Amino acid sequence: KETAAAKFERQHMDSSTSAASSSNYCNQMMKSRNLTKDRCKPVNTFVHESLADVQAVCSQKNVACKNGQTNCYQSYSTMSITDCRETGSSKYPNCAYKTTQANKHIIVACEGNPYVPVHFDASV
Question: Residues within the annotated binding site for substrate?
Fold first, then answer.
């Protein structure tokens, strides 16, 4: 139902803020981006940069993905990101997340025409 590109945007893009706004950022975002409906998605990263800057990573440093695929790209610069991870008290359907803000390079897998991100692989 969702294109791979649109799924990436929904799961990983938050250009509305420069960084996570509070310790409850992940609880709020995981819910509103529909990542807690079927189950608690265990781990998810949000990127606080413009969509244009994240799409641009597909023209940056070509690197292997964790799974061995050759269509991954690492950002030349660090980006503001928030790691969201299920923590102690979490049990579906009351998912609970730890919010960890950081500034790191992102690694994404890209596909299609236009060539855009379709998977968030890792941050460094």
Answer: 7, 10, 41-45, 66, 85
